[PDB]
Symmetry: C3
Subunit: 284 residues, 3 copies
């Protein structure tokens, strides 16, 4: 695209950049391959869990087929796998894939466009395990934060005259992220405190450790993405574009595959009394 006063052309948001050669090296391609393999393995594992999912009473046959929120995490990983498959295809074809081509929500050709579909599901899935309030609200504010990140990505890669819009959108997203982070931390802490005080001398002591570790760790590790934005060339630039892909791949692996495996480990050890305590949680 052309801009007034400059002879340089900008390929962000155009199909002209879609036909350009790739700018990545072997490290980024290897990171994409590793992330795709991990996501595929986790997707198959969660699908096998969903197929052979007896309930907490181990009596219902297709428990996940009727209570489909249990499949929610699986959905995330599945879509994540899709968002990486195209990257692999681009890496095999050798054409440019970063912030170029059509804008589709749920596809990873833009930096935070793929996260729009999966992150609200991640937040709702995490808040459900404690029967926490304000679940759809957190999902909506996370969707807004990701949209702000996408607009910042658009502003950063275009005309240098409009570079300051990226900082404004980043500040907007960071303000609302700090708000949502504080709300989520408070709600999760309160719900876990009530669950711990409801399960005294019950026998669910072993099954509480996995749930606590999962919810606290994978709710605290959501601050890595703003830090990656800060240290990548969008911010200070302490790392280059090739190591930003590796950081993003590691972040997705930790945030999705490990979280799904932790939920799968928790689901095979809890039973009826912990389930009824969880039901009692979301009523007072």
């Amino acid at each position: 695209a052309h801009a007034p006063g400059t002879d340089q052309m900008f390929y962000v948001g155009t199909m002209d950049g879609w036909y350009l050669d790739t700018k990545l090296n072997s490290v980024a391609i290897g990171a994409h391959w590793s992330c795709f393999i991990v996501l595929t393995i986790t997707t198959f594992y969660l699908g096998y869990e969903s197929w052979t999912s007896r309930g907490p009473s181990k009596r219902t046959s297709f428990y996940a087929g009727y209570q489909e929120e249990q499949n929610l995490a699986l959905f995330v990983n599945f879509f994540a796998m899709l968002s990486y498959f195209g990257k692999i295809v681009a890496d095999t074809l050798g054409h440019n894939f970063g912030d170029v081509g059509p804008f589709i929500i749920g596809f990873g050709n833009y930096r935070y466009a793929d996260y729009m579909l999966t992150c609200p599901m991640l937040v709702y899935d995490l808040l459900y395990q404690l029967r926490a309030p304000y679940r759809v609200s957190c999902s909506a504010i996370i969707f807004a934060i990701l949209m702000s990140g996408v607009l910042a990505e658009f502003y950063a890669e275009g005309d240098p005259r409009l570079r300051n819009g990226a900082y404004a959108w980043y500040g907007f997203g960071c303000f609302w992220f700090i708000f949502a982070y504080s709300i989520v931390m408070s709600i999760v802490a309160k719900q876990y405190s009530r669950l711990a005080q409801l399960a005294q001398d019950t026998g669910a002591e072993h099954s509480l450790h996995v749930l606590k570790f999962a919810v606290f760790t994978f709710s605290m590790l959501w601050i890595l993405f703003p830090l990656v934005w800060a240290i990548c060339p969008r911010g200070f630039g302490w790392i280059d574009d090739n190591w930003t892909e590796v950081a993003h791949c590691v972040c997705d692996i930790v945030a999705k595959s490990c979280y799904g495996f932790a939920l799968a480990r928790f689901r095979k050890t809890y039973d009826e009394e912990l389930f009824r305590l969880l039901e009692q949680l979301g009523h007072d």
Copy 2:
């Protein structure tokens, strides 16, 4: 973009127009600033209402955290605020923002693309307060009407050879809007008649006035947008592009901030018997 037979270039739907200088004057920028400030204030007020929201019985602590439909209106305003923040950013950067750049649903860089996310929520939120039937259907038809408006906006700003497509899409949207308008008016009138005949000699006479005023006024004031389309340069052209932004800002302010404040005023005066009458409404 290039068109056959003409040397002129069209910037609608391209990133070339994103880098162009802004075409607005001080009046439109002031209108955008006023709308953004009003939406931000209303969003904070509704968020404070949602945090400190005791139920109709004034016993449940996080009532809005579990019955999250009460937060629905808040969501609208929040997203509306986002749709104006970018406008402010453009006004601060001085680049063109109208019908240019990427097409994202929920962002206001296109005329009716931001309304796609929030208007169905507005319609469902308004129909819920009377426990009215046909709620998702009205939301879907409003989404279709907004999509028709977006296509008309695409056709109007492009090649003059294709100008008549805007009129066709406007006629499609107006036909379905007249249908939906009649259906909504009939349903709301019937539901309010039943509510009025259910609350004889109950004491909810004062609390009924606010609900009646809110639902009737903010369901009747939805016809302003087609009239603005008719009088703007898309239609007869009695006003210019700079005064169309002011009209749109006033329309959003009235349709969203006043409606949210009216719901907040209604929610703090109704109590258990009006709530159980509302519950009885949506059963026969």
Copy 3:
């Protein structure tokens, strides 16, 4: 759009191709007109059914207004009608409409972008009539399959250097479609077997034939779209672009209008005992 090493320009995903003259003949325009007329007639018929919809007991007045899943099929046809109206407009204006212009989900300017909104609703609506499990999962995997088809359409129409990406995306979609097809066939067969063994000596023998024919026929006829992709120029090329539009129009007519008419025929002959058997289906 420009590509390195070639002087040829590619109009896929650009507004430059939106202003080009149409490439269709009278056959494709007639097919579009016929499909639009059929979809409009079916939409009006289903809307009249929804308005005058007494329940299975023939006592509830606005049964479809409160149980709105019954309107789901109607929604599909309505949106399908929208996706064809624009085509008609293009055919009346004479400008190019295939894989050009803005990318909007739910609009038919791209080959499988309109199906994204309606196909998951079709799958959920079909699985609900048997109270089958795994309804949202099938809808999500169908959405992913349609996204893969859209990416294949993008790769096929662009630079010949990137032609092999279309085959990769087609293989991805076909793999997941075979998986989903097998799952849906197994679930539907099991649910219908249980329904048949629950209705012995009941009198619902006549009302079972319509439901069986509808579900089996319109779940089996979903394999036509991959075959059309195989035989069109995207694959072997046994037919041209003008006869691909006719095949797609016939496929939409059969998959949507006939299915909606079959559901309308089934709904006016079943009564309370079949409804309670259907309720008992989705519990064990």
